[PDB]
Structure formats: structure tokens, C-alpha cells
RNA sequence: AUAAACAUACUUUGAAUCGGCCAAGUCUGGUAAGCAGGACUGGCGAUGCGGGAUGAACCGAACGUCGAGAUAAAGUGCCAAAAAGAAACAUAACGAGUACCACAAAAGGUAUUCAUUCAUAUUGACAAUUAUCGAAUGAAUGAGUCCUGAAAAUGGAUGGCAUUAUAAUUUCUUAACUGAUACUCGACCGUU
RNA sequence: UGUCGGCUCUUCCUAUCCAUUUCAAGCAGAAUUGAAAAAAGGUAUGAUUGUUCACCAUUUAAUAGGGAACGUGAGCUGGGU
RNA sequence: AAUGGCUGAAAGCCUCUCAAGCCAGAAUUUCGUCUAGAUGAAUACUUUGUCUUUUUCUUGUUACUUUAGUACAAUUGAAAAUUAUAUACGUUGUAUUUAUUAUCUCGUGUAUUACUCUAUCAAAAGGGUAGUGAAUACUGAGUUAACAAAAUUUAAAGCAUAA
């Protein structure tokens, strides 16, 4: 039989299953579509939610009857500390997929860059990059890094400059950095190369990448409740007050 | 396909025993020939074979198999409807070559098939005579064709490998 | 434009059957499937015969004034008359056909002889290019 | 013995489901077989019909569960692997060792881009035919349904043909070198008694 | 029925070249060059001479020629002479169409480009929408005269299509359209010269 | 050093759609792609050479044999029936099967 | 005429059983029913085996334990043992595809193939522009195929994969082939 | 095999009520009527009755018709039977 | 998609096509975007460089330890596209497994190679250069074989140290 009356469905399967995710740090599943007739610029950045407040701001849309005195918004603080940029990886187009060809890292590297490749670092040894740095500057070695960098040069697709934050700067207890990959969208792939060894081991800005009343997304993890039921869970409706065995469930 | 000529007489009381029934009969085996030869005695004389002596059943063979002639066959056959009068045209070397292509041609065209034919007649017709319009276009003395998309000739299965060697082509041929 | 056509008097070439890789002639086409192949009986051994088109191939060489319907004595005439048998061995075909009969009356003493004297010369003809 | 080669067939201007069926008995035979180009095969059908029946298959899925449902794989190389695992024994030993000696790409990667290609006249396209029915290749009929590396494909396959085009011109010029030589010692008098044993089979 | 063989040839004058590579007629005139690929598996197109008056000479002509097929596919063989006809007489005198602009109380103004490869229509039925309706590779717009254009190009696919997108994008809609006849139309189709 | 045999392809046991018989084995020779080329082969020697991985301290071979003959044709795409002296290993199909040359009437 | 001596005629004592069901070139009641009830026969029950994918009844054929050989129904692109050739009307479509069987009708089409009848067919019919234009044109009917008609509830069923001048359908040719616990020959076990 | 209805909830069918795209009208406009593609999204609040059903008063772009063991009792209620 | 059109035959005309070839057109389909996600890839450090099993230490993994056994660089595998395919020819008629004249010695230089190795420039190459070796052709000559034997593909025991 038919149901009696319509209605929507309660939540939504587009994110079926409701998986909670492993990592603090969200990855962007996407970036801006290239355009090749622009100088070549960074497409993201990663900062850290300090709280929210509220501005009045002065309305400048026309043809509308907000009032003139001001309106009453929410906003979002996002601390963004500068960035250090500790290598650039090219990426090839095949037939599964981006896949990743080589991976250039700068000469000096921070304890805070370091501290991902590890899980008990107190009792690490910390030799992490050691052999790449004291080694950095053989002729074996400086002549591997030319050939990195002409590969990409000539079978490459994609370049993303691998940067992270400095967390001295921040008053979270955490000291191991936090690594993300942004693409550089510009011009060809030779001058993306080239655009990006410039930036080896220099410190990017948030200003250098948004400019300003610029529309940007964020991705990052909801705030954690949990086991819990069907009715914060799906918002379905509660049980009549005489139900047995209980009235937070679909019946 | 065979053709037959088939003798009997009649010797009862109601037939004089001095007159011959002959046909020829198209049929794959001398048996089945006798068998319409009878059918056509007891349902258009009353003749059965009981009361029958059959004389000689012979094979007819083509005297020249190596002429083209253009065939007619006046046959009718059964439908759904009803019955109907069909002359076909072909052009073959014998006499049962021609009759098997009309077998043939009516149990996929007309999806007709044997035991809903009778052949009434089958004769040879000049060059112009042909009325078939695909048929009509070979009977001149001047027809010129190229077989186009050829498929290659294998001598024999001998050397059909499932799996060949290199490309694979067509022959304007 | 299409070179070869099925007509009367085009040399085929039987390509299955007891005679395969026997010259014929058309001397006559009952339709788009079937024609009259008499390559002279006198002659190459192809009996008067209707066979598929699937089974012969066409070769370059016309008969000259064969009409339908040929009788074998005039068709001979005109057979030998443009020497089809002597052009025929000098195509590609021709020296095909007969490299075949050559080929299947060898021994293993012939196989080996030519297998270790083109080895060599291959080798050397290699040898001698820069 | 043991046949430990591979036998790479190109199915450009081939039939899926025909190359499938001697494919797929050659499998349970213990041939190995590499199908490059598994995007230039052609199914009977123009775009139009082609996707009423991937519209069909579609559907099937499971209703309580689609992550266990049927699995619609859009890759042109993938529908290949469906069409002859069909051909194959199901749920047994001798079907699944069977299946493990087969291989698509829509290219022709590293080591069987210089393999010697083979052919199934029972298969191709020329044979089993009318010239004016339409066709669809397996590539064209994928992007329609979702396959997005249609271009990455092309783009390998463009740069595969200037390759190879290079590498035959330069064989071709040592090859009329090496045809030019032969028949210089072939004429020569010293060689007259290894000439005359194969001009008598026919070989020169 | 299945035809033997149909045959159907079309003319080319002095000033026309013609080459053929695999189904693929290229033709050269006076005015310009033509392209086009007829791909139907079981045509063959060729050039040659031959008589085409019953008393006049020889001349040259490109033949198509079609051998045993049905009745569907034997009729693109005079498909395919109309178009390499339609070629000839469009690189030699090119096609232009007519097109005029009806209005009932609305005056429609056109804003043609400078280069003619792109118009604009506006004010069509007092709607503030405007329509730009792009114009094929070859075909060139002009305002000819007064609620008037015509349209200039060597290829009558491109140029019959281009005239057809003019009119398709002012149609009437939800109206009864035998009163508001209103867009613009095809006076007449005809050669420039 | 030498090569004296086809090589044949052990396809399966006679059988039918829900049957199997595995006293006859069904083997598919080399070049032989009618039952008209057949007639060479039938009561030619065929052994089916398999290796099995001994321990060094066992006495037994590491390399076996079973040994049959074809005794005649199974359709006419060359198909041969072979009879052994114990049935073959079903786990052995698609194997290469060594057809030799004798007893030779030649 | 044919067959019949482990033929024929029995006598005595007794068991179980009398809920039946199915098929059909059959019938009666009923709108019809996998509904109810009958005449004749064959089956299932009491019965496995090979085939129809699967199925109490359909098709072949009825069973001691086996070896080899021809076969039956029916099959021969792969699952699956086994086929090659010939001609056609089909096929731009979830169209076609193993009877019982698991569905489709009336009706319509300037869709297509073939046949019959009639008229125009030339020194000139039809279409287009009396002339040119120069070979078929028009009408009616019948028989096959195709398309519309054709809408149901979990996602799915020519068995599946797949085919498309077929690997579909209708008919053929070839002293082609495959295959049952039935047939022939042989070995052994038991009854007579 | 827990036998009505309601409540809660998901999914499915199209023989479509609305929204989208089209053709026709005895379609001037507005409002309507007949039909095609299309089932991805929506399709209500109450008085009386245990009612399914019904009949009223509104609101809405619309307040369409049905299936899932006449969906759903170790999900509820027990009004009816 | 429905639908409206373009050129256009069949059927000299007409026609949007129960023809080939195109365009416009949906809350539509597919890319793009979002969520979960298998086989994967790059980089960092630790190793190892012909190979395995049974044991064994550890929370566990890798390297590691002992006793053996096993192989030792050098002829493999690519035209593309079309098929009514420019003209000519039809090059016929057996895909992989599976195309080397038994072993060793003596010999002279030259030449060749999708051959091996070294150095170098490059390179997600059957790459270039230079050298060396191997095999082959010019192209030989000589020794030996009789009975026997001509086989790996992997077994068995450990926890000192490091990550």
C-alpha cells in the first residue's frame, strides 16, 4: 500500500556513508581548472579557525532595502600564518589518473617537516633529509636534480609546490607541521618550473595567493559528536509520548 | 532433387485397363516420387493403388548441363488466406537445379514451405521473356561487374589458423 | 574505376575444389553469384561448370571475342590466341603458383642444403652493407 | 613444452564479442594474450541505440545495497574483460587461472607497443559485415557513458604513430641496403655454386 | 529492387578543378575552395570524360558510381551529385539568401558587426532579451536595405543553415502564431551572380 | 638439442554437456586444423612430461612421464583422441602434450 | 494369414488397494480458470537415465557390474563435446532466436520483397521547364517481413556472454560431426 | 504465517496533479482544452466518523492515482472487530 | 528526448531522413563539482643486490645469524592508415609454443649488429658518441663420441646487533 501523505526524505544519501574521516587535515579533492594564459599563481593556502565574531558593513548592492545605517553579519576568523615552501612535485596525465613523477625538495628543512615522517620522535633519531642535505651539493647529486627538473619539464602535467606552516607561530600545543600540496595554475609548464624553484625554501604570504571581497571555498572536518540517534542523526520526527520501548527512533 | 517419369494403369471396373497415367515428378528419391505420383491419381481419377499397376519409374537426366536456360515454373501454393497461382523465372543448366532454387526462394520469401507447393509446369522461356527485375539485369550479352569486398579464398581448411599473422585485408579482387 | 569485372570472357582463377590454382574463362553469369567457368577443358582441365563467385578470383587478362555461350572448340582458339598461359606465368601470381609446386617436392636433404646456404648469404649480405 | 610468449593481438577494426569468443576458448588452452587497442573495437549499433543498452545495464543494481550491486565499468578496456570473462567457466579454478592471462589497454604501453601483433579473421570487422550498418567504437561509446581518459589515450596513440613512423623509415632504408647487397653476391661467380642449389627449388 | 549498377555524373565547367583522394572532393573556382568527406562505404567517386549530349562533345565529369544494392543505399548516389553540384556552382557563382524582417507594432532593429561574421537582434516583440545568433565559417551577413539581409557565403550547407539559425532564435512563443506573424524570414534562395 | 615432437594441447576428456568421461583425452595437435590431415597421426606416441619438485632425499625422479597413444579423431577440426596409461590430471588442461614420430610408417 | 510348450487350463490360500493426478488433431457446466465432471489410450503415482537452462507427467528411452563401438531425442560462435558451404525475406530495434512454455489482438502505414490483373507504354507516357525534356509510368488486389498499436509496481533474464550480407530466421548440399543406464559385440555376478 | 485502521519510515510503478521542453484548438490577449518527451524534485492544515470511504471549511504552483504478505503489532496504539 | 528546421534523394517535381549527412532544442544524460573508496604512484629514512623453505626472536616488521644447495654478459617480438582501399600487383596455400650444421682446438685481418659491458651527453628513448668483448660472413683445417651420466626450479636450524 501506498503511503498516505508525502513528504521529503529525511537526510541526505549524497554523503552516505557517514564515515568519520582519519586525519585533521582536509585534502581538496579538486583544484581551480587550469588556464594557460595567465602568470602562474598559487591556488590555495591552509590556516587555523580561531573563533567567530560579528561586523555591521555598509551595504554598496543597489536596488535593494537593506538599510543604509548598516547590517548585522557573522564572520569567521581564520589565523594564516606565512608559509614555507620545502619542495614542488610534477604531476603526468596517464590513462589511470594523475600520477605523481618526481618530488625536488630544497637543501634545509625544518624540524617541523621532518617531524611527519615519524610517529615517537623523542625516540626517533631524527635523521630524516640528513642524507639529502649533507649530500646536497655533490656533483652526483646536484646532477640528479637537473635531470628532475627537465623531466618534468618534458613529460608533466601538473605542478604543486609542497609548503607547510610554521606552528611556532601559533598557540596550539602541536609542533609537527602540517603539509599541503598547492597547485601553481599559470602559464606553461616550463615557466611553472620555473616559478616554482624560485620559491624553494621562501616563505609565502595569504596575500600573495587571495587578494580582496575575493569568493573562496573551505574544506575542513565538522566538529565531532559521536555515537548518537536517528533524530540528530537523519531528523526524523519523535514517537507519540505513549509509544512502548521508547520514542527516539523510526518506527 | 530428381525428376522421374512414372507409368500406371488402373484395372478395376470402373477404369479401362488400356489407358496409361505419365508424369513427371520432381522428388528426392524414387519413393517419394510414387508417392505424388499417387496422390495425383487418387485425387483427381479415384485411382488407388490397391488397384493400380505401376509400369516404369525412371530417372530423367539432363541432356545438355552445360547450356544456360531461363526456367519458368507455374506452381501454386497454400497462404494463410488462400490459394494462389505464382510463376517464378530462373535461370540454371537443369531442370532440377532450377526447381531446388524455386523450393528454396518461396520457403524464405513466402515462408512457404514444400508440403504447400505444387508444381504445375516447368518450361524454358526466351532471353526477353524474363520478367524478374533483378534477373532481367543478366540476361544480356553485355553484363559487366566488379565483385567488390572479396573475402579471401581459403584452398582448403587445411590452412584456417584461428589466429593469423599481421593485418587483415579485403580484395577489390 | 574498378579494373577487373566479372564479364565473359575474363580469365579466373580457381581458388578451392579439385582444381585450385587452375586457369578458367567465364563464358557466361546466370547472376551476381554464379557463372559459367569453361577454362578450356583441352587445355588447362577445367570441365564446363557453374561455380560460386566465393570460390575463383579474376586475373588481368580478357579473352578477346569470346562471346556467351562459347562453344569449347572456338573458345580454345581464342585461349591460345592471346596466350594466356605464357603471360600468366610471368605475374606474381603465376610465379606463385609455381613456387608452391616447387616447394612441396623437396626432401629434408633439399630443406637442409637451402636453409644453411641463405643463412650464409643473408649473414654476408648484411655483412656488406655500412 | 612451456609457452611462456604472449600473444598480443591490435583490436583495431575488429568485433567485440567475435574477438571475445576465440579469445576466451584460447585462454582455457594456456595462451597468454595482451589485447592493445581495446578502444577501437566496434559493436553493431549507431551512438543512439548503443546507449539504450548501457541505459539497460545500468539499471541492474542491487536495491538494498548498490555498493554490493552490479559493477558497470565505463573503461573500454574493462568492458573487453567483462565480455570475455562472460565466455568464461564461472565460480571454479580452471575459470579463474583462465582469466588471469588477459590484458587490455587503450594504448599500447612499454613492452607491447613493439611486440609482434597478430589477427582473428573470424573477428574482423571486413568479414562479418555489411558495409552500410554502423558501427560505434568501444572509445566513442565509453565517453559517452563516463570514461574520461578518451584524450590522454589519443593524445599517446598520436605520439606512438610519429614514433614509429621514424623507426620505419630508417628500417626501410636499411632493408633496400641490405635487398640491393644480396643481389650483388647473388650475381657474383664465386657464390654460382650455392646460387645454382636454389635456383633449382626456386628461392633465388 | 537491387540495381545492377546506378551511375549519375555532374559537369565540371573551365574554371573548376576538381581532386578526389578517397572520397574526399576538394574543389577550387574562381571564387574560392571547397571541402567536403562523403563517407558512404559503397560509393565511388571518380573523374573521366563522357558524352552527356546526344549530339554535343565530350566533356569533363566526375562520376559516381554505385554497383548491386538495395534501394536505400542507391539513392545517395544522386544525394552525392547534388552536393558536388551545389560546390561547383558555389565556388563558380556563389549562393546569397534573402531574408526579410516582419514586425506588427514592434520596429525590430538588426546590429550587424563590422566584419559581417555576427548580428544582433533586438527589440523583437518588446522583449529586452537580445539575440546574437554566430554565423558559419564562410558566411557573411549584410544589411541589404530597409527591414532587409542577406546572406553571402560559397557553401549552400552553411549558408542555408546560418539563415535557418536567424530565424530559429525569433520564434513566437505561447502565442497564437497565426496572428503574431512576426520574425525573420526567407524571401528567396539564389545565386550572387 | 633437438626437436622431435608437436607440441599438443590437453584440452579435456571426452565427455558431453553434463558428463565426462576421462578414459579418452581430447588433444588438439599442432598444424593439424582438419580431420583430413588426422590420418598421419593416429597411432603416433604421445607422453605428457611433468615435473614434480623431490626432495633431496628422495629416490623418486623429479621428471615423469605418462605415455599414450592417438587412437582416432574427434570432429573435423583436427581433434584427436588419445588414450594413456593413466588417465591424465585434470589439473594438467591447457597443458603442452609431446606427440612424437613413432611408430613411425614412414 | 500371423504368432504361441518355461504354451495352455487352472485350483487353493492370502496380502495390499478402491483420496488419485496429468496429456490430448475429445466432450459437457461455466465469461474463464493451474476450475468441476466424463468416453478411449498412454503416463505420473511406483521411475531413475540423455534432451528441453531449471520442472511428477513433455521428447528419446525404461536401469545387474563393466570395456569398446555405432546411434535416439536434440544439437555443432564461448560457457559446452560437436560443421563447412549455398540462396534469400529480416536486422538502425531490449527486432529475431530450442515445441508443451510461461503471452499479445483488432486496426493503420507513399515502409520493404515478390506475384496476378488493367491502362499509358514512341517516334515520343509520366515529372519538370504545343515544343524540349527521352524509358519506363500509373492503378487495383493479394502473399511474406518491418513499424505503430504495446502502460505496473526490488534490479534481471532468447539460460548467460555475445551476434547483426549473423553466431537470427525459412529452406537446402556434403558416405560431416557430437551423444543416453536404450542397441551390437565381449568379460563377469545372479534368476529361469 | 498475530487478523482493520491510524501514526512513523524507505523504496518502487506511470495510466502525470504542479514545475521544465514541445505540437494542436472553434488558440486575438488572459484563462482554458487535447496530446508528446520526462518519474530527477514536490504533492498540505482541520470539524464529524474506529472507519478505508465520504462530505464540508481553508491554504497552495499542485494539494495525482497506486504497489511492496490488501508494506510496516519481539515498531507503537487497541479506537473497531 | 519529444519537437521545429538545413541540404537532399528515392520518385527529373516534393519531402526534416520507415535514406546517407547536419543544426536548434528539457526540472534530461555525461563531463566539471561534492562524499566514501580498491589496485596504486612519488618522496624521506633503514636496508639489500641470484634465489627459497623449515625453524626461530619480537607487541610486531625489516635487516640480521648458522648449515647447505643453486645460476653466473653477450643472435628474443613494432610501419601506420584504408578496405567502393590514387594507378599497377593481388604478390597465392599453416599464428604462438616451434626456424642456429654435435663438442672442443687451431687459426688472419676486415666488416656487421634493435647484442653485452665500461665512460660520457642525454633520456619517463628497442638514443647519440668512444672503447671493449660475443656471435656471424669472408672460410679452412684438425680431435672426440660407442657402455654409464647428463636438472635447477630449495631445503634445514637461530636472535648478537641496528632501524
Redesign the pocket.
Given at each position: 500500500?501506498?503511503?498516505?501523505?508525502?513528504?521529503?526524505?529525511?537526510?541526505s544519501?549524497?554523503?552516505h556513508?557517514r564515515?568519520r574521516?582519519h586525519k585533521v587535515r582536509?585534502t581538496?579533492?579538486?583544484?581551480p581548472?587550469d588556464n594557460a594564459a595567465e602568470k602562474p599563481h598559487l591556488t590555495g593556502f591552509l590556516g587555523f579557525k580561531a573563533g567567530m565574531t560579528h561586523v555591521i558593513r555598509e551595504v554598496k548592492r543597489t536596488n535593494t532595502k537593506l538599510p543604509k545605517d548598516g547590517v548585522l553579519e557573522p564572520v569567521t576568523i581564520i589565523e594564516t600564518p606565512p608559509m614555507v615552501v620545502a619542495?614542488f612535485?610534477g604531476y603526468?596525465k596517464?590513462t589511470?589518473g594523475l600520477?605523481?613523477?618526481?618530488?625536488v625538495?630544497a637543501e634545509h628543512i625544518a624540524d617541523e617537516f621532518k617531524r611527519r615522517?615519524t610517529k615517537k620522535w623523542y625516540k626517533?633519531?631524527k635523521?630524516?633529509?640528513?642524507?639529502?642535505t649533507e649530500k646536497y651539493n655533490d656533483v652526483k647529486a646536484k646532477?640528479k636534480r637537473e635531470?628532475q627538473i627537465?623531466?618534468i619539464k618534458?613529460?608533466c602535467d601538473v605542478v604543486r609546490v609542497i609548503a607547510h606552516t610554521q606552528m611556532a607561530l601559533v598557540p596550539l600545543k602541536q609542533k609537527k607541521a602540517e603539509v599541503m600540496e598547492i597547485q601553481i595554475n599559470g602559464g606553461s609548464i616550463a615557466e611553472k618550473v620555473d616559478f616554482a624553484v624560485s620559491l624553494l625554501e621562501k616563505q609565502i604570504s595569504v596575500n600573495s595567493v587571495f587578494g580582496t571581497d575575493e569568493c573562496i571555498d573551505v574544506?575542513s572536518v565538522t566538529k565531532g559528536h559521536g555515537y548518537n540517534g536517528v533524530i540528530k542523526r537523519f531528523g526524523?520526527?519523535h514517537?507519540?509520548r505513549?509509544?512502548?520501548?521508547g520514542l527516539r527512533k523510526?518506527? | 532433387?530428381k525428376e522421374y517419369y512414372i507409368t500406371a494403369r488402373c484395372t478395376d471396373k470402373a477404369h479401362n485397363p488400356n489407358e496409361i497415367f505419365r508424369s513427371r515428378v520432381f522428388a528426392?528419391n524414387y519413393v517419394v516420387a510414387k508417392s505424388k505420383f499417387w496422390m495425383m491419381l487418387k485425387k483427381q481419377h479415384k485411382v488407388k493403388k490397391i488397384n493400380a499397376e505401376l509400369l516404369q519409374c525412371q530417372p530423367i537426366f539432363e541432356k545438355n548441363p552445360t547450356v544456360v536456360k531461363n526456367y519458368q515454373i507455374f506452381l501454386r501454393y497454400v497462404?494463410?488466406?488462400?490459394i494462389?497461382?505464382?510463376?517464378?523465372?530462373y535461370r540454371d543448366v537443369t531442370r532440377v537445379g532450377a526447381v531446388?532454387?524455386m523450393?528454396?526462394?518461396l520457403?524464405?520469401?513466402?515462408?512457404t514451405?514444400?508440403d504447400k507447393i505444387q508444381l504445375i509446369s516447368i518450361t524454358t522461356v526466351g532471353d526477353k521473356a524474363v520478367?524478374?527485375?533483378?534477373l532481367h539485369q543478366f540476361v544480356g550479352h553485355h553484363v559487366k561487374f566488379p565483385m567488390?569486398?572479396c573475402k579471401?579464398?581459403?584452398?582448403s581448411?587445411?590452412?584456417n589458423?584461428?589466429?593469423?599473422?599481421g593485418?587483415?585485408?579485403?580484395?577489390?579482387? | 574505376?574498378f579494373?577487373?569485372f566479372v564479364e565473359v570472357g575474363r580469365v579466373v582463377?580457381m581458388?578451392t575444389g579439385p582444381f585450385?590454382?587452375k586457369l578458367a574463362v567465364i563464358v557466361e553469369i546466370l547472376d551476381?553469384?554464379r557463372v559459367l567457368v569453361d577454362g578450356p577443358q583441352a587445355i588447362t582441365g577445367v570441365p564446363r561448370q557453374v561455380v560460386?563467385l566465393?570460390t575463383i578470383?579474376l586475373?588481368?587478362f580478357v579473352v578477346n571475342k569470346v562471346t556467351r555461350g562459347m562453344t569449347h572448340k572456338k573458345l580454345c582458339l581464342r585461349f591460345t590466341q592471346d596466350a594466356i598461359i605464357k603471360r600468366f606465368n610471368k605475374?606474381?601470381?603465376?610465379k606463385?603458383?609455381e613456387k608452391?609446386i616447387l616447394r612441396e617436392k623437396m626432401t629434408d636433404f633439399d630443406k637442409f642444403q637451402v636453409?644453411?646456404i641463405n643463412?650464409?648469404i643473408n649473414?654476408?649480405a648484411?655483412?656488406?652493407?655500412? | 613444452?612451456?609457452?611462456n610468449?604472449?600473444?598480443?593481438i591490435?583490436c583495431?577494426?575488429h568485433?567485440?564479442?567475435?574477438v571475445?569468443?576465440?579469445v576466451?576458448?584460447?585462454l582455457?588452452l594456456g595462451?597468454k594474450f595482451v589485447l592493445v587497442r581495446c578502444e577501437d573495437l566496434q559493436?553493431?549499433?549507431?551512438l543512439?541505440?548503443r546507449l539504450?543498452?548501457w541505459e539497460?545495464y545500468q539499471?541492474?543494481?542491487?536495491?538494498?545495497n548498490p555498493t554490493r550491486?552490479?559493477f558497470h565499468h565505463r573503461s573500454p578496456a574493462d568492458?573487453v574483460r567483462?565480455?570475455?570473462?562472460?565466455?568464461?567457466?564461472?565460480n571454479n579454478y580452471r575459470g579463474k587461472l583462465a582469466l588471469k592471462n588477459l590484458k587490455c589497454f587503450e594504448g599500447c604501453p612499454?613492452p607491447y607497443?613493439?611486440?609482434?601483433?597478430?589477427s582473428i579473421p573470424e573477428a574482423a570487422?571486413?568479414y562479418?559485415?555489411?558495409?552500410?550498418?554502423?558501427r560505434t567504437l568501444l572509445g566513442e561509446l565509453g565517453?559517452?557513458?563516463?570514461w574520461?581518459y578518451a584524450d590522454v589515450v589519443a593524445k599517446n596513440e598520436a605520439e606512438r604513430?610519429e614514433?614509429?613512423?621514424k623507426?620505419?623509415a630508417?628500417?626501410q632504408l636499411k632493408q633496400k641496403a641490405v635487398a640491393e647487397a644480396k643481389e650483388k653476391i647473388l650475381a657474383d661467380e664465386?657464390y654460382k655454386a650455392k646460387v645454382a642449389i636454389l635456383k633449382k627449388f626456386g628461392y633465388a | 529492387?537491387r540495381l545492377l549498377k546506378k551511375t549519375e555524373h555532374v559537369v565540371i565547367p573551365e574554371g573548376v578543378n576538381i581532386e578526389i583522394?578517397?572520397?574526399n572532393i576538394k574543389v577550387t573556382g574562381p571564387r574560392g575552395s571547397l571541402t567536403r568527406e562523403?563517407?558512404?562505404?559503397?560509393?565511388?567517386?571518380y573523374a573521366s570524360k563522357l558524352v552527356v549530349k546526344?549530339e554535343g562533345p565530350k566533356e569533363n565529369v566526375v562520376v559516381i558510381?554505385?554497383?548491386?544494392?538495395?534501394?536505400?543505399d542507391?539513392?545517395?548516389?544522386?544525394?552525392?551529385?547534388?552536393?558536388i553540384k551545389?560546390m561547383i556552382t558555389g565556388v563558380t557563382k556563389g549562393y546569397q539568401y534573402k531574408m526579410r524582417v516582419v514586425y506588427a507594432h514592434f520596429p525590430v532593429t538588426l546590429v550587424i558587426a563590422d566584419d559581417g561574421k555576427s548580428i544582433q537582434v533586438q527589440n523583437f516583440l518588446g522583449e529586452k532579451r537580445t539575440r546574437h545568433i554566430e554565423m558559419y565559417d564562410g558566411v557573411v551577413v549584410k544589411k541589404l536595405g530597409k527591414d532587409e539581409i542577406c546572406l553571402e557565403g560559397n557553401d549552400?550547407?552553411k549558408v542555408?543553415?546560418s539563415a535557418?539559425?536567424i530565424?530559429?532564435a525569433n520564434?513566437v512563443?505561447?502565442?497564437?502564431?497565426?496572428?503574431?506573424l512576426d520574425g525573420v524570414y526567407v524571401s528567396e534562395?539564389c545565386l550572387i551572380e | 638439442k633437438?626437436?622431435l615432437h608437436?607440441?599438443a594441447v590437453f584440452?579435456?576428456f571426452?565427455?558431453?554437456?553434463?558428463?565426462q568421461?576421462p578414459?579418452?583425452a581430447?588433444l588438439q595437435i599442432?598444424?593439424?586444423?582438419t580431420?583430413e590431415?588426422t590420418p598421419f597421426y593416429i597411432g603416433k606416441r604421445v607422453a605428457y612430461v611433468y615435473?614434480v619438485?623431490?626432495?633431496?632425499g628422495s629416490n623418486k625422479p623429479?621428471?615423469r612421464a605418462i605415455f599414450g597413444k592417438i587412437?582416432?579423431?574427434?570432429?573435423?577440426?583436427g581433434?584427436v583422441?588419445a588414450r594413456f596409461l593413466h588417465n591424465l590430471p585434470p589439473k594438467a588442461m591447457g597443458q603442452?602434450l609431446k606427440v612424437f614420430l613413432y611408430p613411425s610408417n614412414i
Open positions: 500500500s501506498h503511503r498516505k501523505f508525502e513528504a521529503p526524505r529525511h537526510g544519501l549524497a554523503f556513508p564515515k574521516v582536509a581538496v579533492s579538486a583544484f581548472k619542495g612535485v603526468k596517464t589511470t600520477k605523481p613523477i618526481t618530488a625538495f615522517y626517533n633519531t635523521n630524516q633529509f640528513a642524507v639529502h646532477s635531470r627537465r623531466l618534458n613529460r574544506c526524523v520526527r514517537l507519540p505513549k509509544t512502548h520501548r523510526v518506527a | 532433387m528426392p497462404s494463410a488466406g488462400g494462389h497461382n505464382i510463376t517464378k523465372q531446388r532454387q523450393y528454396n526462394d520457403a524464405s520469401q513466402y515462408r514451405r514444400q520478367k524478374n527485375p533483378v567488390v569486398h579471401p579464398v581459403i584452398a581448411k587445411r590452412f589458423l584461428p589466429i593469423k599473422a593485418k587483415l585485408t579485403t580484395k577489390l579482387c | 574505376v579494373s577487373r582463377l581458388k585450385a590454382s551476381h553469384n560460386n566465393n578470383s586475373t588481368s605475374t606474381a601470381t603465376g606463385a603458383i608452391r636453409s644453411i643463412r650464409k649473414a654476408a648484411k655483412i656488406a652493407v655500412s | 613444452s612451456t609457452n610468449k604472449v600473444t598480443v591490435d583495431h577494426g568485433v567485440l564479442g567475435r571475445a569468443s576465440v576466451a576458448k584460447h582455457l595462451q559493436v553493431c549499433g549507431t543512439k541505440m539504450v543498452q539497460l539499471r541492474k543494481r542491487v536495491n538494498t550491486g552490479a568492458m567483462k565480455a570475455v570473462r562472460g565466455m568464461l567457466p564461472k612499454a607497443d613493439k611486440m609482434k601483433k597478430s570487422a571486413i562479418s559485415f555489411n558495409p552500410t550498418r554502423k565517453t559517452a557513458v563516463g574520461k604513430k614514433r614509429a613512423a623507426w620505419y630508417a628500417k664465386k | 529492387p583522394n578517397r572520397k562523403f563517407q558512404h562505404p559503397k560509393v565511388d567517386i546526344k558510381d554505385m554497383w548491386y544494392g538495395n534501394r536505400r542507391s539513392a545517395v548516389v544522386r544525394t552525392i551529385a547534388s552536393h551545389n549552400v550547407e542555408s543553415q535557418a539559425n530565424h530559429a520564434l512563443r505561447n502565442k497564437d502564431i497565426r496572428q503574431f534562395k | 633437438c626437436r608437436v607440441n584440452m579435456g571426452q565427455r558431453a554437456q553434463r558428463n568421461y578414459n579418452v581430447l599442432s598444424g593439424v586444423n580431420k590431415d615435473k619438485n623431490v626432495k633431496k623429479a621428471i587412437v582416432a579423431p574427434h570432429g573435423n577440426h581433434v583422441k603442452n
